[PDB]
């Protein structure tokens, strides 16, 4: 197929569907006519899109963990624990990494090994292998909405199965579930395959079935400048809306400076709404998700709580619709159900200690929001120019030319030229600009911010600072200070 930012026709989509469902025998379990009626019978309390609307109406931040294991009963047991003992507002199912690479043969092997070992040897739930019948068992066993959380460049079959499975949200997008999660996949092909996932939600919404979509904001979770991360989310929201998506959660990964973070999340929500409306998408319901610190954690569990709850406080004060919970086991391995519920309990307690509180406007905040929107607009403007009005083509070309460039992405289609580093107050800034198309004024403000750190630490700003920042939180602080 040729890539264009245009809604796929019904015939186009069906033709692709018949090919996708053949990629694993559980594809045979997907019946759209049957799935629509199943979906319509799920109570509103278990519909992710409808519960987001309620949370926005109530002014509350909802808490959602990450969770998944190889075997079906164990996976349900785990979700039930997070629900019941954790107090989760939303439930995930975290998909294993073989699934994410479309290796269902390896999924099956790992299911077998997990059965023998009595513990999960997969780092997540093999949804394709468990099929629609398994994903339905999961939904039926819990009392909260379910979302597929993962990181899959070609997610078409997974999406068909989890949504027919009654899972009413799908996370991801053609940039955010490519560049952080892949090496060899072109940006053209991941955008085409994510148009499928979005078009599938479009179909369901045309039938009156409401299903949330959530672009993955934090990307590599490693010093991503807010303006670069927001440009990706806004892009993914626009490309989703063109295929008919109506309920979108845009996301942002904590950088650590509270004002920068709140500015980023507000700019993200505002510019996303602004762009959708500017391009004629006038019926899209937009929510926000704040992810707690997605870089390296401290191994000490008490220090991990220091990270989890300061992150939550930022989320709370930002007015985030949703916050994704980290656990005291983050530095070490996939959390036990206990460690996970500790994360959720700590998180929800912080939220409840901050009920209705918001960060008030300040000059400091105003200034930072203006920086982030201008930066973001530089990028987006360039993308539209390169695509000659077509944002999907513009994205392909932006990656080809370093206009969009994600720090530390493994994708060979990512330039890897732009270098981020923190300033003296811990805000993430641009150290090296690469081909990111900023004006001199924007570039000079980043340099000015960064010189204040050089002066204070008595060393030139440098890649060594970057490495220090990569290690800082695991070593007990935000900023990679010398010694």
């Amino acid at each position: 197929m040729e890539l264009k930012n245009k809604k796929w026709t019904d015939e186009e989509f069906h033709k692709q569907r018949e090919e996708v469902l053949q990629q694993w025998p559980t594809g045979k379990e997907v019946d759209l006519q049957e799935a629509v009626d199943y979906l319509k019978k799920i109570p509103a309390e278990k519909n992710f899109a409808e519960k987001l609307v309620l949370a926005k109406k109530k002014g509350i931040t909802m808490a959602q963990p990450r969770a998944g294991v190889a075997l079906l009963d164990e996976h349900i047991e785990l979700l039930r624990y997070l629900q019941d003992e954790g107090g989760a507002d939303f439930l995930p199912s975290t998909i294993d990494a073989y699934t994410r690479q479309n290796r269902y043969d390896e999924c099956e092997n790992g299911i077998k090994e997990s059965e023998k070992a009595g513990r999960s040897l997969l780092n997540g739930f093999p949804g394709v292998n468990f099929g629609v019948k398994g994903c339905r068992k999961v939904l039926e066993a819990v009392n909260l909405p379910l979302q597929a959380r993962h990181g899959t460049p070609d997610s078409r079959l997974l999406a068909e199965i989890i949504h027919a499975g009654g899972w009413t949200s799908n996370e991801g997008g053609g940039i955010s579930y490519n560049v952080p999660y892949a090496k060899n996949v072109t940006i053209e092909k991941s955008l085409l395959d994510w148009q499928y996932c979005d078009r599938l939600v479009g179909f369901y919404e045309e039938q009156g079935v409401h299903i949330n979509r959530e672009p993955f904001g934090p990307l590599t979770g490693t010093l991503v400048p807010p303006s670069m991360s927001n440009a990706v989310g806004i892009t993914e929201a626009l490309l989703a809306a063109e295929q008919g998506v109506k309920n979108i959660t845009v996301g942002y990964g904590e950088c650590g400076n509270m004002i920068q973070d709140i500015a980023a999340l507000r700019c993200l929500e505002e510019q996303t709404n602004e762009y959708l409306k500017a391009y004629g998408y006038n019926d899209v319901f937009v929510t926000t998700v704040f992810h707690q610190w997605m870089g390296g954690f401290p191994q000490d569990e008490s220090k991990a709580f220091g990270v989890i709850v300061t992150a939550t406080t930022i989320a709370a004060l930002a007015g985030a619709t949703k916050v994704i919970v980290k656990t005291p086991h983050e530095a070490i391995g996939i959390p036990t159900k206990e460690a996970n519920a500790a994360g959720i309990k700590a998180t929800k307690m912080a939220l409840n200690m901050l009920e209705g509180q918001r960060m008030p406007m300040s000059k400091e905040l105003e200034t930072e929001m203006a920086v982030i929107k201008a930066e973001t607009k530089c990028i987006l403007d360039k993308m539209f120019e390169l695509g000659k009005g077509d944002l999907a083509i513009g994205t392909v070309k932006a990656f080809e030319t370093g206009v969009m460039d994600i720090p530390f992405g493994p994708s060979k289609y990512n330039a890897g030229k732009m270098m981020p580093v923190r300033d003296n107050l811990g805000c993430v800034r641009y150290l090296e600009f690469g081909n990111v198309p900023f004006t001199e004024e924007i570039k000079n403000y980043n340099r000015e911010r960064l010189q204040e750190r050089a002066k204070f630490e008595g060393r030139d700003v440098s890649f060594q600072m970057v490495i220090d920042d990569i290690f800082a939180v695991g070593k007990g602080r935000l900023i990679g200070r010398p010694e």
Binding site: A97, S120, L121, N123, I332, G333, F408
Partner: protein
């Protein structure tokens, strides 16, 4: 010494890349020739690169937890490839979840790994062990 060569990568269906960049930089700065095959690397890519570059050691990083599955068998393919005696290192977050480390270490040594590293291992440790093992301290 005499520029020693290592193959460095991340095994299996694992896409984590930041540790790899740092390991590359640190071992390069310690004087090694780093042949970095990058992420999402199957066993056969470690072996091919070790053959072509006459590597002294293979450093297998595994962060995503399924390394327990992925790592099985490397030593035998290496021998079958004519790389008997090559040094095989494995580290990162090599099992799913928090586990008792001496049990984990044992399991991977049993797989034929010369050295096995726990979460949070500083590259300097691997660099010191490798210089010792290659008798170039």
């Amino acid at each position: 010494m005499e520029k020693k060569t290592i193959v460095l990568g991340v095994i299996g269906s694992d896409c984590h890349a930041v540790g790899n960049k740092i390991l590359d930089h640190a071992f390069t700065n310690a004087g090694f020739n780093v042949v970095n095959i990058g992420v999402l690397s199957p066993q056969e890519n470690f072996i091919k690169a070790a053959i072509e570059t006459k590597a002294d050691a293979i450093l297998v990083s595994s962060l995503y937890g399924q390394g327990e599955i992925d790592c099985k068998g490397l030593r035998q393919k290496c021998d079958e490839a004519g790389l008997e005696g090559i040094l095989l290192y494995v580290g990162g977050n090599i099992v799913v979840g928090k586990q008792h480390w001496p049990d984990v270490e044992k399991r991977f040594k049993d797989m034929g790994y010369d050295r096995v590293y726990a979460p949070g291992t500083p590259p300097e440790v691997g660099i010191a062990d490798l210089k010792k093992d290659l008798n170039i301290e």
